[PDB]
């Protein structure tokens, strides 16, 4: 049921870094377990991952640097609400 989101403006996309947003009320301990499952499943498939940040307080989830090849796998993790590819913002 989790969906993937990316910037519609192709020049502003930043593939390779993703915000994994977990369902509302997901506890910090579960966000850490979900990130650990992603890293282990990606390693079993021969991919390197790095957790850059763990979110808690505003939205639950984490920021991960990984190949976009892992998106189908990451979208199947049960606590995932949605995954968004990073993108650029600019001074107006």
């Amino acid at each position: 049921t989790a969906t993937f989101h990316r910037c519609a403006k192709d020049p502003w996309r930043l593939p390779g870094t993703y915000v994994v947003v977990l369902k509302e009320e997901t506890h910090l301990s579960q966000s850490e377990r979900t990130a650990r499952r992603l890293q282990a499943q990606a390693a079993r498939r021969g991919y390197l991952t790095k957790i850059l940040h763990v979110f808690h307080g505003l939205l639950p989830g984490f920021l991960v640097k990984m190949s976009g090849d892992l998106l189908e796998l990451a979208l199947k993790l049960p606590h995932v609400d949605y995954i968004e590819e990073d993108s650029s913002v600019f001074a107006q």
């Binding site: 947003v21 979110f55 939205l59 920021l63 990073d86 993108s87 600019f90 001074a91």
Partner: protein
């Protein structure tokens, strides 16, 4: 009331804003010529906007207390993830009076950036953002497209659109053409700049004053008053 600014680095000791901005610990920017990486250039955008809000000679809310977070690099570029982590930093600071959060930046429509802004608005934070300078529908950009954020387009003295984004996602238009404000070229320098960032900073200054006079003023009441006085 405090105005949080998520933007470039600031020249905090420029005479126009000296004493107003408490630079926070927050910095999350993407990687950075030598001329364009000098402090006077890195600091340009945020220093001008801190002046529009709080500046002694040219501020809308002269003397306002501000806090700055660095989410844009020397070229004015940031990421959705860095901006998100900055918004989380503000939420953590709030959990430990009224708050105005000024986001004078835009990217493409982002589900997570809109969701983070929505969570802050649900907690009682007043967020103000630039509509964007793409002569396009603001609903295609973020945080402009978030209904919980006050999205500000730019007009001139004759109420004509400055170009500015427009449409159903723009809550109001405010002055954004040739706005005189602090220039980081030198400690007493001033420069005129145009854009929806300047218009959003004007509205943040108006909001800060309204909230100082009426601390129990909610976002829903405030929003309609700002839209009316535009």
């Amino acid at each position: 009331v405090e105005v949080y600014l998520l933007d470039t680095s600031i020249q905090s000791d420029h005479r126009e804003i000296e004493g107003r901005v408490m630079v926070t610990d927050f910095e999350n920017v993407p990687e950075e010529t030598r001329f364009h990486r000098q402090a006077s250039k890195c600091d340009s955008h945020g220093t001008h906007l801190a002046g529009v809000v709080s500046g002694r000679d040219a501020g809308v809310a002269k003397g306002a207390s501000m806090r700055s977070l660095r989410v844009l690099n020397c070229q004015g570029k940031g990421t959705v993830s860095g901006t998100l982590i900055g918004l989380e930093f503000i939420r953590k600071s709030q959990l430990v009076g009224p708050l105005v959060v000024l986001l004078p930046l835009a990217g493409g429509y982002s589900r997570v950036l809109n969701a983070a802004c929505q969570r802050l608005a649900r907690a009682g934070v007043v967020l103000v953002t630039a509509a964007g300078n793409f002569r396009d529908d603001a609903c295609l950009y973020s945080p402009a497209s978030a209904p919980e954020v006050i999205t500000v387009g730019a007009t001139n003295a004759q109420d004509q659109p400055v170009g500015t984004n427009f449409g159903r996602c723009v809550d109001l238009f405010a002055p954004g053409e040739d706005i005189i404000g602090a220039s980081s070229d030198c400690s007493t320098c001033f420069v005129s700049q145009s854009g929806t960032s300047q218009a959003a900073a004007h509205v943040a200054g108006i909001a800060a004053m309204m909230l100082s006079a009426e601390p129990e003023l909610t976002l829903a009441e405030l929003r309609q008053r700002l839209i009316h006085f535009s």
